[PDB]
């Protein structure tokens, strides 16, 4: 099932917007509330199907959860009371739709000494091996991961492959373990660091933040408290790119600029004038078209692959030639940009984009986030109307990018 | 969206079923009707979303199409009148939902001297092959735009084997001026079935079933009739279901000489098998299946599209079976669901080791792809109690869901919306 949005191109974007929290921060953070003694308020929560599922999962585990729904200008506020949690078995009927559900394994094991989570549909060894390094007995039977541990005990563990959710799950197991834990080859994404910041706010002792080596001094209990989820750096970048490629001027509020260095530096190369505070970013093109940019995606803190499709759209309308290097087949959106008249040639992992002033609106299809963000952005400058058919599960309502782009002067409408 | 299928396991299957046509035969064959001067009747047509889309596409190009809907025992009959066809540009709104839409490029180009098809959401063998026949082809604004006053016979070698590439270029060659030789062609029986159809309409093609097709171009294709090749994968699925429940089934309107590798593997599992010119009878004579070993390989060797079903068979068989999947890239998606039923499966790279068991127990499982669906339904036939399969909406083929024909063989399966 597919609804349409219709973009009328041409206008420079002007105004201010705010973004909400990053998905890969909020999901483990919601699971971490199971570790706490008192209620925990999580603010800046985005609207995502996975957030809704996780809230439902916490409730079925026995937590009392309330949701103050977010708006265009602020994320949701979720209060989790973990005290009445009385289940260590995660229900398959909910878990089966959300791979992130593996993130309850660490907390439930630490809180209850036992935990059961279904194997995902479709990797998992880093979670099992890492928790075993803390002394858990873990077996897989009948498609369930079954874990038990009288008392988790600090130890040394090195990840074989870098894993964001692996790092998070083992970290949550370590904060209440007896003694000191050292994890090597940890994921370094800011979403991991935001989880660690949340745990510290609740009483955890973690050193080495932002690096591949985390040192955890186990404490007996975590308290309740409050945590504002790290702003979504990908959303922030998307609005900055949309401002840049329309020759406009936008200010993004409640941002976290020190998670965006590589992106902001690339926008400067495109001709943007950028100022940053401790919580805002202002981009001003001063009436200029963007210059085409070259980029290569690389692990954080280098240029993020999750911004590549958006910069490709920028290059499609920029002055000059831009070469994009993708280090997985990450160019599904190319043929859709070609329907708009873009000049893109793909050679292996490299896309060469020659920018043009003559993109023309046409019907296009978006079946994933990359196609969606890139096609909406291209639509902002294509002549006439771009009609984007988007798959149903991408719909985020008030946090669809087109809703905030409209508030910046774009002409975009949903046509069911 | 997810409907539920509930299987009660245990019963040996007995009876007869018939299967309808293979998808990868019917789709190019429907497109081939654009080449003809008179109406063409296509029989044994399966119910598939792509068939529905292709019928719509032909109508939007200007053909007049009628459908007599198939049943459990007979595929559909479609009559295509290509005479009023008046469009060489395939509409994006329809094309965008079906990658197989590229198969109108060759026919429209040959009939009209021009054709435009949207890029899909690879394609190079189709473009290069038609260029070898003298077509001018460019890609602009996301459309493949081809033109040729007159296609001309030539030589072309496919860089990699392409089923739909072979089909599209073949359709361009049959009305070309002069003689064409295509090398490194796909050898799947569905390709050969398209060639049989073209010959029935007047084409001259030699080398059927081989990597080299030799085509003497003719001036016109006539109208006529073609019965689509029976689906060998559906045939195998029902034979496997009979084998693993210890039953006895006859599959009617079969094409046994497209099934050699599958029948040989079922013999290895303990099946007693007879074949006529159009039927297959499998009899387990009250035995549990023996575990089998297999390595998927290009036709006519063991087909990857039968691998998940034989994995389910091995889950309930006597012994250990080694299954090596070297073709299907996203492999073994169904393994973790089979584990929820109690199966004993270990995976090492591209190889799964299955120790069969009499102790599979029904449980909730999820099927988001054809392999998961077929393997979980089959395993559900023998697991104790009830297996509850959540299946994604786009797999629903209604009366051609395998569970509908399995029910007619004594299975207890019900749809629970």
From Swiss-Prot, chain A:
The keyword Cell cycle applies. One of its GO terms (molecular function) is UDP-N-acetylglucosamine 1-carboxyvinyltransferase activity. Coiled coil: none annotated. Pathway: Cell wall biogenesis; peptidoglycan biosynthesis. Pfam families: EPSP_synthase. Keywords: Cell cycle, Cell division, Cell shape, Cell wall biogenesis/degradation, Cytoplasm, Peptidoglycan synthesis, Pyruvate, Transferase. SUPFAM superfamilies: EPT/RTPC-like. Phosphoenolpyruvate binds at residues 23-24. One of its GO terms (cellular component) is cytoplasm. The keyword ATP-binding does not apply. GO terms for biological process: cell division; cell wall organization; peptidoglycan biosynthetic process; regulation of cell shape; UDP-N-acetylgalactosamine biosynthetic process. UDP-N-acetyl-alpha-D-glucosamine binds at residues 99, 123-126, 306. Its EC number is 2.5.1.7. It catalyses: phosphoenolpyruvate + UDP-N-acetyl-alpha-D-glucosamine = UDP-N-acetyl-3-O-(1-carboxyvinyl)-alpha-D-glucosamine + phosphate. Cell wall formation. Adds enolpyruvyl to UDP-N-acetylglucosamine. This is UDP-N-acetylglucosamine 1-carboxyvinyltransferase.
């Amino acid at each position: 099932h597919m609804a349409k949005i219709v973009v009328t191109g041409g206008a420079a974007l002007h105004g201010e917007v705010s973004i909400s929290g990053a998905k890969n921060a909020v999901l483990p953070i919601l699971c971490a509330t199971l570790l706490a003694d008192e209620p925990v308020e999580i603010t800046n929560v985005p609207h995502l199907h996975d957030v809704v599922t996780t809230v439902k999962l916490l409730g079925e585990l026995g937590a009392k959860v309330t949701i103050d729904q977010g708006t265009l200008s602020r994320g949701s506020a979720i209060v989790v009371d973990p005290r009445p949690v009385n289940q260590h078995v995660a229900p398959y009927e909910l878990v089966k739709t959300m791979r992130a559900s593996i993130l309850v394994l660490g907390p439930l094991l630490a809180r209850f000494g036992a935990a059961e989570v279904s194997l995902p549909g479709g990797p998992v060894d880093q979670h099992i091996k890492g928790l075993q390094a803390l002394g858990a007995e873990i077996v897989v039977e009948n498609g369930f991961i079954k874990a038990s541990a009288k008392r988790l005990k600090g130890g040394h563990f090195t990840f074989d492959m870098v894993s964001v959710t692996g790092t998070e799950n083992v970290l949550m197991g370590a904060v209440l373990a007896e003694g000191t834990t050292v994890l090597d080859n940890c994921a370094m994404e800011p979403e991991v660091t935001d989880l660690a910041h949340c745990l510290i706010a609740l009483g955890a002792k973690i050193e080495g933040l932002g690096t591949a080596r985390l040192v955890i001094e186990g404490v007996e209990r975590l308290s309740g408290g409050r945590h504002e989820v790290l702003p979504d750096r990908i959303e922030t970048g998307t609005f900055l790119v949309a401002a840049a490629m329309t020759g406009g001027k936008v200010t993004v509020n409640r941002a976290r600029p020190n998670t965006m260095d590589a992106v902001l530096s690339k926008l400067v190369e495109a001709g943007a004038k950028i100022e940053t505070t401790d919580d805002s970013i202002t981009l001003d093109m001063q009436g200029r078209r963007p210059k085409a940019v070259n980029l290569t995606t690389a692990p954080y803190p280098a240029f993020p692959t999750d911004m590549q499709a958006q910069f490709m759209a920028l290059n499609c309308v920029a002055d000059g030639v831009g070469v994009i290097n993708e280090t997985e087949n990450r160019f599904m959106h190319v043929n859709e940009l070609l329907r708009l008249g873009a000049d893109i040639q793909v050679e292996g992992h490299t896309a060469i984009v020659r920018g043009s002033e003559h993109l023309s609106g046409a019907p296009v299809m978006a079946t994933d986030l990359r196609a969606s963000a890139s096609l909406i952005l291209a639509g902002l400058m294509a002549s006439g109307d771009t009609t984007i058919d988007r798959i149903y599960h991408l719909d985020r309502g008030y946090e669809n990018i087109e809703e905030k782009l409209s508030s910046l002067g774009a002409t975009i409408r949903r046509v069911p």
